[PDB]
Amino acid sequence: TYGIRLRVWGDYACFTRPEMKVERVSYDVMPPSAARGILEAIHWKPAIRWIVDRIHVLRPIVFDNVRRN
RNA sequence: GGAUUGAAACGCCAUGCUCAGGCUGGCGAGUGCGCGCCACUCAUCAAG
């Protein structure tokens, strides 16, 4: 009818919380800003503006620790 | 084609387990013990 349905998946993800940005702590789920970014990575033009309706979480929320220089 | 608290981001440089120390000194398989007691090769069949 209208709108889009795009499935995205991956082994790793980090949607850093703004208040724990140095020692990164990720959100439990992708925020709408991340969804916007992913959608624009496929197609975007200045004439058009993305709006995110919903996010579906299909896998359990699992965390992990990685340290980098 | 402006922005995915994003875009950029080595754990990295290097460091003998080494120097050495008999498994040795010595200890009869040994003392002894009938294979032995008996038993027909034998009853026959020209040489051509």
A46, A57, A51, A47: which is closest to A36 by C-alpha?
A51
Method: cryo-EM
The Cα–Cα gap between A13 and A27 comes to 10
Written as six digits, the tokens of A19 are 């208040």
Resolution value, angstrom units: 2.7
Strand B positions with any atom < 7 Å from protein CB?
Answer: 1-6, 9-11
The reply to whether the CB atom of residue A52 sits less than 7 A from any atom in nucleic acid chain B is no
SS3 helix, strand, coil % of chain A, rounded to 5?
20, 5, 75
Secondary structure of A45-57 in the HEC alphabet? CCCCCCCCCCCCC
Task: Give A4 CA → B27 C1' in Å.
Answer: 100
Residue A10 CB in 7 A reach of strand B? no
Inter-residue contact A6 to A50 (CB < 8 Å): no
Q: What does the alpha-carbon distance between residue A10 and residue A7 come to, in Å, rounded to a whole number?
A: 11
